From a paper:
In this study, two fungal chimeric class I TrTSs, Talaromyces verruculosus talaropentaene synthase (TvTS) and Macrophomina phaseolina macrophomene synthase (MpMS), were characterized. Structural analyses of the terpene cyclase domain of TvTS and full-length MpMS provide detailed insights into their catalytic mechanisms.
Because recombinant full-length TvTS was insoluble, for in vitro assays the TvTS-PT and TvTS-TC domains were expressed individually. The structural basis of the cyclization mechanism was investigated by determination of the crystal structure of apo TvTS-TC by soaking with the non-reactive substrate surrogate 2,3-dihydro-HexPP. Although 2,3-dihydro-HexPP was not clearly observed and we cannot completely exclude the possibility that the observed electron density originated from polyethylene glycol (PEG) used in the crystallization buffer, the disordered regions in the apo structure, especially the DDXXD motif and the active site loop D173–D182, appeared clearly structured following soaking with the substrate surrogate. This observation suggests that a major conformational change occurs in TvTS following substrate binding that facilitates active site closure. The TvTS active site contains the conserved DDXXD and NSE motifs and other residues that interact with the substrate’s diphosphate. Aromatic residues in TvTS-TC (F65, F89, F187, W188 and W310) are observed in positions analogous to those in PaFS (F65, F89, F196, W197 and W319), while the PaFS residues at the bottom of the active site (M221, W225, M309, S312 and N316) are substituted with smaller residues in TvTS (A212, Y216, G300, G303 and S307). The high similarity between the AlphaFold2-predicted model and the crystal structure of TvTS-TC offers a basis for the discovery of additional chimeric fungal TrTSs through structural prediction, which is not possible from amino acid sequence analyses.
Author numbering: 2 to 93, 124 to 156, 183 to 234, 243 to 322
Write the structure that this text describes.
């Protein structure tokens, strides 16, 4: 039931067969997303430190957030984008808590109850729970507590598909600078990079196909809450958006350092 996003023809995903047949959707407010990325970089330089050669969720045509949370509420896009960009920077001391406080104040002013759920998920660390806090806040979703255990267990497949794809597309630039799936497969099977890569692709397609099927069944049954279903359906655009973004995003392009 789409109100804020747009489906994009990107025929290379069919040839790549990593996202099953999940379409690419992109939030139409890419401009707000970039504004929140710029502000996060301005605050980081202001409070934390200088940034040189850093690239986060910005891609040449769309950003990470607009492809992966395509139905993100427009008035929440900047904040959601800022928080995603800040998590990218944090992953790569007084100012950090000052930036966090500001972000917390902006979130509480938008959605008090759902900022608390989100913060709870973000204190645990597990990257599952970061994306869980961000998506639920970005789309103003309230997962019934009786459904949470089941919803999170189901979403794990989409997190694995996107997580492994990420490592697949980040290994090259990461090696040039390992805690990557390609390296583990190169230990266990003692194989070359391209052979670990083909094994990784097999696993990605398993996880992706299982997720697509489960979400189809749950949607067809309509016995879970609309917010749980909306969260799970966002899991699908997170797989297609992650992959499409990975193709050309500066973060993983060797052309940068």
């Amino acid at each position: 039931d789409f109100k804020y996003s747009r489906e994009l023809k990107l025929e290379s995903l069919d040839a790549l067969n990593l996202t099953e047949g999940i379409p690419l959707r992109v939030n139409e407010n890419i401009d707000l997303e970039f504004r929140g990325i710029e502000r996060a970089h301005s605050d980081w330089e202001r409070y934390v430190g200088k940034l040189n050669g850093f690239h986060g969720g910005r891609g040449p045509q769309f950003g990470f957030v607009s492809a992966c949370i395509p139905e993100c509420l427009p008035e929440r896009m900047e904040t959601v984008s800022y928080a995603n960009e800040f998590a990218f920077l944090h992953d790569d001391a007084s100012g950090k808590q000052q930036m966090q406080a500001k972000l917390l104040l902006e979130m509480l002013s938008i959605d008090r109850e759902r900022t608390m759920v989100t913060i709870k998920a973000w204190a645990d660390f597990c990257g599952e729970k970061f994306w869980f806090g961000l998506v639920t806040f970005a789309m103003a979703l309230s997962i019934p507590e009786q459904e949470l255990e089941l919803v999170q267990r189901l979403a794990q497949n989409a997190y694995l598909a996107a997580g492994l794809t990420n490592d697949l597309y980040s290994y090259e630039k990461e090696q040039l600078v390992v805690f990557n799936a390609i390296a583990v497969i190169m230990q266990e099977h003692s194989v070359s990079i391209s052979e670990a890569e083909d094994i990784c692709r097999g696993r990605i397609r398993e996880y992706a196909a299982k997720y697509v099927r489960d979400v189809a069944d749950l949607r067809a049954k309509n016995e879970l809450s609309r917010d749980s279903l909306a969260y799970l359906e966002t899991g699908l655009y997170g797989i297609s958006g992650s992959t499409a973004w990975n193709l050309d995003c500066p973060r993983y392009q060797v052309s940068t350092f």
